[PDB]
């Protein structure tokens, strides 16, 4: 890993604690990291830090320093989880990034369904999705294609900002190898566009599917998509025209939206563009 100037932090600086969480990918914990916000070295900053496993791949390790490569090069974001920098060097490499206190979006959701843990209002739904439309608009603006959009990897902070995150299979738009048979093997499958699979591709008309189902888990507080279909069943309805059910209490209106970005043919989905214009006016006329 040829040492970064910008990124590195000095390994003796930081003090590992509590764990966060712990997947197949590695693992992640909370961590004081004392000068890591230059410019005030004084002060010690609650950050995450992620690193691998003792049961740890070499596909483990050149995934994370890819999710790190990736974060470098995409800018500053209200809804973007950002990178604050990275052990390199002399020691497990460590990704030290902002941290969420509220946990990921699944969960914030989950823990706050009316109780038949301060429910979610229907105005705070939409603000949800009109933020991470916003986080899109911009990763697409960046030419970056997250291919992983999910509850589950989008993180809450303290004053409810919602932030995309999870950049372990994002990659620059011209790095994929269209039409390869091994393309696309690794993305989650209820998650994913069907041209994903079908067609070997991937562009930010996909991301759009993967929105949309982000949107359904968002209105049914976290629920699970296509609940009782197993994945291995799924294209087979989805070529045959199955799309999942309008959440309850979700309107007429955002669930067609949710229907726009499944469409068949990726063209014909919006654009995130599209949809922050859409939401900005519902979440607007809803405040009024
Ligand atoms: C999308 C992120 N993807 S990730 O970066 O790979 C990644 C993958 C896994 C974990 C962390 C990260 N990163 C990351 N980065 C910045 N901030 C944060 N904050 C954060 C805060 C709380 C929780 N939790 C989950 C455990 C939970 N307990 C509830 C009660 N039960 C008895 C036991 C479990 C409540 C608190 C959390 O876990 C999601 C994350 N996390």
Redesign the pocket.
């Given at each position: 890993l040829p040492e970064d100037p910008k990124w590195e932090f000095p390994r003796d600086k930081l003090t590992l604690g509590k764990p966060?969480?712990?997947?197949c990918?590695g693992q992640?914990v909370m961590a004081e990291a004392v000068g890591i916000d230059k410019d005030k070295p004084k002060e010690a900053v609650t950050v995450?830090v992620?690193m691998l496993k003792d049961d740890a791949t070499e596909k483990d390790l050149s995934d994370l320093v890819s999710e790190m490569e990736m974060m470098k090069m995409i800018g500053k974001h209200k809804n973007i989880?950002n990178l604050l920098g990275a052990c390199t060097q002399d020691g497990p490499l460590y990704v030290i990034?902002?941290?969420?206190?509220?946990?990921?979006l699944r969960?914030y959701l989950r823990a706050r369904r009316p109780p038949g843990e301060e429910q979610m209002t229907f105005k705070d739904l939409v603000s949800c999705t009109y933020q991470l439309a916003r986080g899109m608009e911009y990763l697409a603006s960046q030419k970056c294609i997250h291919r992983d959009l999910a509850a589950?990897?989008?993180?809450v902070t303290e004053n409810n900002v919602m932030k995309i995150?999870?950049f372990?299979l994002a990659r620059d738009i011209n790095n994929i190898d269209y039409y390869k048979k091994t393309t696309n093997g690794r993305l989650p499958v209820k998650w994913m566009a069907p041209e994903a699979l079908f067609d070997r591709v991937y562009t930010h008309q996909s991301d759009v599917w993967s929105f949309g189902v982000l949107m359904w888990e968002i209105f049914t507080l976290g629920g699970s998509p296509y609940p009782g279909i197993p994945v291995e069943e799924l294209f087979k309805l989805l070529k045959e025209g199955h799309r999942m059910d309008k959440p309850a209490n979700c309107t007429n209106e955002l669930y067609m939206m949710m229907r726009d970005c499944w469409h068949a043919v990726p063209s014909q989905r919006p654009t995130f563009k599209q949809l922050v214009e859409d939401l900005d006016r519902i979440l607007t006329l809803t405040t009024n």
């Open positions: 966060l969480g712990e997947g990918f992640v995450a992620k989880i990034v902002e941290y969420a206190s509220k946990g990921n969960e589950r990897n989008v993180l995150a999870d372990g």
